[PDB]
Structure formats: structure tokens, C-alpha cells
Amino acid sequence: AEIYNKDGNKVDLYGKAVGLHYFSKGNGENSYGGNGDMTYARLGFKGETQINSDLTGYGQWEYNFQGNNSEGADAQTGNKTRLAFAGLKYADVGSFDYGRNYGVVYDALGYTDMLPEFGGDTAYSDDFFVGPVGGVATYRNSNFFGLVDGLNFAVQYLGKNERDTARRSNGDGVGGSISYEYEGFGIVGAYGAADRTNLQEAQPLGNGKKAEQWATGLKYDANNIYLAANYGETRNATPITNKFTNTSGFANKTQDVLLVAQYQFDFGLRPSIAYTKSKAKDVEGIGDVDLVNYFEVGATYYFNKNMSTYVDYIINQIDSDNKLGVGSDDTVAVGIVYQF
Amino acid sequence: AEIYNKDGNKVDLYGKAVGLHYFSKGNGENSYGGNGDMTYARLGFKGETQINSDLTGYGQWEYNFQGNNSEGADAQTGNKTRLAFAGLKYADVGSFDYGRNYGVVYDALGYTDMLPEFGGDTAYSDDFFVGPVGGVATYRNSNFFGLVDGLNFAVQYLGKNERDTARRSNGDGVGGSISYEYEGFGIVGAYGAADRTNLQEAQPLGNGKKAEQWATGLKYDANNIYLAANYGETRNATPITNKFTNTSGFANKTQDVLLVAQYQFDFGLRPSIAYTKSKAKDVEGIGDVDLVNYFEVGATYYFNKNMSTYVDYIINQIDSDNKLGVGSDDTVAVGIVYQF
Amino acid sequence: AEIYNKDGNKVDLYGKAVGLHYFSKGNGENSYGGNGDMTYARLGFKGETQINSDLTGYGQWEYNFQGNNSEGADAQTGNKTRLAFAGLKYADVGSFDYGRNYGVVYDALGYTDMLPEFGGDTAYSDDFFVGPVGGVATYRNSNFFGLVDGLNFAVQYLGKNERDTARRSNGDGVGGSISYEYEGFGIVGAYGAADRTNLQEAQPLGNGKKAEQWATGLKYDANNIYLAANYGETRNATPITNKFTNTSGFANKTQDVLLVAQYQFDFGLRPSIAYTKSKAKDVEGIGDVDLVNYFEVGATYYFNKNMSTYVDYIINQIDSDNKLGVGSDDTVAVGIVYQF
């Protein structure tokens, strides 16, 4: 909500309270999304200040507050800062920002990250260029310096992040994306490569000294219709765990496919139909293994711009004999969202 | 404070900074409330959006920020999300919400949870239906579908919560309350029963496979006068700890009594007089033991609706020979509260 | 930003998103400030309510959200409540507040805590009266009861804080400051002494049963010019660690000197030049050791009151043979700040 706007500075304080619950059989250990209370809330700010007609400064922070913890010991479980960055936009020259933000490859994966509760399986956090990552300096250009309507690009510099965990770490790397949008149509290509850390290399699964990720996207966005498709691959970037051996590391290679079709009815109902499949190749020991594989049927109903509810249903296609131990059961999410 | 209100949506951002300090002798280990700095702050939001004349959506989140930690390692100690839920209200049909909220039995205990700093000893957190609990779906009806002024009820469904701790866990259960309010008078009856988890059953104290809690309340609220009384009992629900053996579990049974009398002077002074007593029965090994037992004298002075100060004084009646080791010393709380 | 102001109560919700990065060679283990992503954000509130013409109530909370953590396990690292207190101001009688706030000696050290990213080396947190501390009751008088323009003082009572760590703990103590400001000039003298806890005394470094800290300040603040100087000493208060022995405790004695010169150009550029030096004396085993020692060259450029960027550069004078193991490398901070 725009709670402030004076002297060229306007702050928008925003957030939401999400009553959320997952239904899956058993202890949801073997299901797709788990089972039980998954309620949570968000709070963040987006500020923008007009330094002059061409120059704009801005910043943004968003935090995630789990609503399913006890006020006991586990109280902080799941809590985190999702985004935190500041930057400047200058006329038709482009924008630049730095801090915790979205890796460039997400410029592609964004296309299909549209399901009501699930979806976007490949956009992992603290995983190089696919989801939010800390320490990214991002330059973005729109309409090619104002000379080409619809042509945009971005280059992104990832600063080394040596965390206590191979999964949450990264070396330096560069990434970039180009996309073009012409009347309801949009196409994107994004790519990034980075160094792996000593610890990432000390892991049992995956072999290499460089991590890679690229994805292409295609979309048709107009007339209440949203159809999107993504395809990408990765090298030693996708984190995987052998539930049997309790071994961990990164997939040597993956080929990912995401499809999403949705329609927005005038009365507020947005039915969704999607398909996701990510398969690892050359996993040391297993060979080829599916990591994600399912159909999605779901629907969101918007009471208005502040209230909505939805049922997301995962028809898991992974089979009970999956070598990594990836879960094979279905999961049904039901939620009620208020937001401002 | 109502920081936003446009297009049928109004957000109220609220909070407070509480400078608080406890005075009790010794290391306050043997006192009622402890001793020392207990300063803390709250921040939360309450949103409400009119979907149409009969339909209302809403959500609420509140967080607790301890103000007595070091910015060092212990920095997060005590911090937590207290409430987080979203829901809808429809004409005279009733409201429904889900998320972290107040158990239904609190509809009763609320009556006496009115002391300046202490009080409400039996409304424990993450303890089934008595205080805030995660995963509760709540239906509330007012004025009996609009057919009976003053008659309200609620039914509440508790979703199983399997935490690492028997104290912060719960199985599925149902609860309900009915209350009636007629001109300054109000009476309530609330009740809930739930399954106990394996871990709750693996505990040394308390024996059963079902937890119970019910409380009745009576009040007179009018003419600057507030008098309230509560009585309730519980079965295997009240958490207790043997400080000697360092044993823990739940009381097999408790009988709780709460009394509160207060008066609001025109100039801002609200003196308080209360009495609390909770006694456990059949505790494995000890027999009958008092858990809480004291008199309360306190006063709050309101400078206005945003500023106030108060002195709460506990005249602990527990005696030094209490078998569980419950503290016997007095505690005096002094506070200064700013809020918006 | 002043998001609320009605009925004599005005709330100011404030904060900032700071994209920040440190450049230092090696793994920055041996540098002054470290190396890498240091992005973070702040969020806080300052409320003020006019109880009547002479009486004002107020409160303030500020939190620090690290923007360089993974949403993984380390997610909360660095997060903390910086300030949290409530109080009252009465006509020309003075103000009083309690909670987590700034120790009185900071009334002095504030003078030089003006560098773009570094500086203020001696104003340690949870370290008695020099930085923020929990449990402080503070009385402040301005213009000597309204009888002496420019003459102010404060007395501050520190409540014992027994934390799990000798570094984050403290016993009871009193502190006070007096300062005088006459047309661009200002002079301050501050002092505080407190009891040390058993644990603080159980430490390997430093010897005594009372902690002391005093600092004097001098400043010239006018005409786009800011020149400030501080000098102070301490007894068993300054925390130190022997990186070789991994031993810790407090310096028996320190003599601290801070100098800062800055100029604000009309177009937004504020160049900074500073010098800091803190040296420990009588450290058990080492003798005299420098703790901090460097020159600072830096500059801040204000695009406006909401946006700015800066480069802080530490020319570390500490030498590679420093007995405690204090780092000797340079550090360059670059930041981009949005704020409201």
C-alpha cells in the first residue's frame, strides 16, 4: 500500500497474511509438498525517489515470517530476508542495483512461476543465478537505450559467497539475459556461469569447477490468457540429496521443462493447468533420475485486489522407485490470502 | 494506527515500545516473575477489505521483538510471531479464519486476562486451546445469525502439530464456545478436547491419550467498573515441570480460578485487584500441588490513548515448600508504554 | 517517513535498504573490515504523542535485518533490535526513558561517529556505557531547566545484565554527561562506572571489580564544516581477544583518540578525513598493544534526502606484528543507500 508520497519520495509498505494448509497422506515425508499448517506472512517496503527528471533512486526489502512455528524454541524457523537492495535508474541509460536480489536466469524462469501455491521448482534459493541470491550487482536496460521498443537485457555480477554450507555457497560469476516483447508475446534467453567453492567441490555428488545455468522462455500474455513455457539445463548447479545414503551435492546435469496455461475469468476465477519435469543426468551412482515430475490443476479466485483463496493440486508423476528417494505422493494446498 | 484507507481497503499498522523492569529478590529464580530488564516491542498489521456490502476479507499479523537481548548471540531470544491469519466475514452468516490464532477456550479466559503486567496464568501458548496456537480454523457466529442479539458461538478445529517438543505439540481436536452478553453482563462457556501426540505420551508426568480444557466466565462490564471471574479445569493439558527432578509433562488434572476487579477513574487511573490460583491434582509422585497462587494489586494510569505507565505487584501465596519447586517470592513490575 | 499524525499522535515509520560491499585482500581475515557482501536493511518506528502542552510521551524501536545471509540456516545471522524504549518529556524539567538505548558516554563519542561506513571504533555494543545497552534508565535535561541556553546534562542508571557471555554482560552502574553548545561550538564530558559480573571477572584478560569509561569531546559544527575530536580512556571495559591464544577479556586500560574533518559541498558531496587510534595498556602478557589505528579518506554524495552513495577507505596503520593479531590490511567500502 502506498503509505507515503511527498517531496518526490513515495514509500509503499506492503505485505500479506496467508492462512495455508497442505494435505498429503502419511507423514507427508513421501509426498510432494509435505503436510499440515504452512501459514505465513510477509512484510516489506518498496521506496522510490525522483532525484530529478531523469534520475530515480529506489530500494526494497521484504521479509518472510513463518506463521506455523511455536513461540517456543523453533519460533524463528523459516524466517528470512528475501530481498534487500538499493539502486538507481537513469533516463534511457538503464538501472543498476546491488544487494540480495533475483539471479538473472530467473528472468526466464519467471515465465512459469505462476501456479497458485507450487510451481517454479527449478528457481532454487541461494543457488547461483536461478532464485534470490546475496551479493548481486545488476544492470538492466529497457527498450535498447530507448532505440528499440520491447528489447531489454541485463548483465549480472555475482560476488563470491562462502557460507558454512556447500548448498548455500558460491564463487564469482557473470550472467546475462535478453528478452523481447511484442504485443502479448515475449521471448527470453538467460545464462550464467560461476566458480564453485572448495566446499562445493568437496561434496560427494557432482563434479566440476564451474557451475552453469541457462533457460529459455516463451509466452503469450493477453486476452485473459496466460500460456508460458520454459526449458533449461544446468551443470553442477542443481542441489540434490540421496535420501538413502543421506549423500548430497549437485546434479552433474539437468534438463528442465515447465509449461503453464491459465485463464482469467471476468468474475475472478483463474483456473491453472501446468506440467513440470526436471531430470538429473549422470548423477554419480544412480544414472538418470527425475527430481520433479507432475501435473498441476489449481484455481485461484480473486474476491478483489486484497483478498483471494485457492486450491493447488499436485498430481505427482514421480514413481515410488525413484533412486534418490524423491517423494511420490500427491499434495493439495488450500489457502486464504489477505494482502495490501 | 490507520495508515491506509482507500478503495475499500484499510490497513492499520500498529505497535508499541514497552520499557519494562521486574523487581524480585535473589536471582529471581525463586520469585514469581523473575527479575530485571524485560523491555520489549511489538509491531503488527490488521487489514480489512470490503469485497462487497455483505462480504469482508481480513488478515492480521503481530510479532514480538524482545528489547532485552544483546545484539550478540542471544539477540533473537524471545522473538516470535504471535498471530498470523486470514479470513472472511459474510453478512449474518459468520466469519471464518485460519492460521496462528487464539484457541477457543481463551474466549473464556479472556475475561480475567486484564492485569497491568501479569495475570492470565492459565492461558499458555502452544498449549491446545487456551492461548495462541498454530493451525486453527475458526468459525464464529454473532447474534445467532442475526436472530438473537447477544448470543454468539464459535467452533474451532485444531490441526495436528508435531513439534520437536512435547510442550509445543498437539494432535487433532475440536473446540467450541458459547457466550451471552446482555447490557454490561456477559457469560461464557468454552470447551475443547484433542489428541495428544506420541511424544506428549512419552513424557514422565501426566497420563492419557486425550487432552481436555474447559472454562466458564462471568463478567460485569459497565460504569467504569470491570469485575470478572473464571473457573476451569483441564486434563493432561497443563504443562508442569519438577524443578527438583527436572522432570516434565502435563498435569493429570487442574482446577483453575481467576478473579479480577478494576475501576477506571475519569482522570486515567485504573486500580486493579486480582486473585489467581491454579492447582494440579494427581501429579504422578507429588499428589496435589499449587502451580499458581497469589494476590495482585496494581494500577495503570493512562496519560492518553498512546501513553501509559503501571505498577503490577504480585503477592505470591505459593509457599517455600511447594513440591514442584514453583517460586514463592513476590515480583513487582514497573512499566512505561508508548503505542500507536 | 511521517506516515501518521492525528489527535496529537504522530508516528514516523522509517528505514533503509543498504547495498554494501567490502573490498580487502585475502580472505579479509587479516584486513580491517573484512571482505564481501555486507548489504543490510533497517526498519523502525519513532512515535510521539502530546499528552498536553507540557507533557510528551514517546517511544522508539529499530531493528537490523542483515541482507547477506542465505535463506538457509544462517538466515538470522546479524539480526537484532538496536533500540527499544519509551519515555516522557515534561516542560523544562527534562526527559526520562527506559529500555534498550545509548549509554551516556556515547554523548561524547557521538561527535566523531560520522564516517561514511566505518569510524566510531570505540562505541562498542553491549559494552557498558559506550554504545547501545539494554536496561538503561536515562534522565536528560536541556538548557539547565530552561535557565541556561546550551547547557545540558544527563545521568544514566544501568541495570545489571547477566548474559551467558562475559562480553555481553554487566553489573549495575551509574553514568553522566554534561555538554555545552554555543554557536557552532560544542564541548562534552561524559563518564560512567559499573560493577563487573562474576563471569567478566572469570576472564583471562583484564583485572578488577569495576569497569570505567570516560570521554571528552570538542566540535565545530557550522558553515558546511564539521570538525570533531574525541579522547577518552577506559579501565577493564574494552573487550579484546588474543587471536593467537584465542584468549579473551577486557583491556586493563585504553587511551582513545578520534579526529574527524568533513565539508559539505552545496552540490551534495561530503568528503571525509579521519584518524582513529585506540591502544591498550598493561594487557596481561602483551604489554601495550594497538587495537585500532588508521586514517580514513571517504566521501558521501547525496543525490537528495532519500538517496546517496559513498566510498569509505581505511588506510590501516596497524602493523603485521601486532601482538593480539589485530588485522593490518586496508578495507574499502562502497555503498548505495535508499532511505525514508
Overview of this structure, please?
Three copies of one chain form a homotrimer. Chain A is mainly beta and 340 residues long. Chain A has one domain: Porin. In chain A, 4% of the residues lie in helices and 57% in strands. The longest helix of chain A is centred in the first third of the chain and has 4 residues. Chains in contact: A-B, A-C, B-C. At the A-B interface, strand 2, strand 3, strand 4 and strand 20 of A face strand 2, strand 4, strand 5, strand 6 and strand 7 of B. Chains A, B, C: One of its GO terms (molecular function) is porin activity. Chains A, B, C: Homotrimer. Forms mixed heterotrimers with OmpC and with PhoE; other mixed heterotrimers are also probable. (Microbial infection) Trimeric complexes with colicin E3, BtuB and OmpF can be cross-linked and immunoprecipitated.
Name some characteristics of this structure:
340 residues, 3 helices, homotrimer, mainly beta, transmembrane protein, Porin, outer membrane
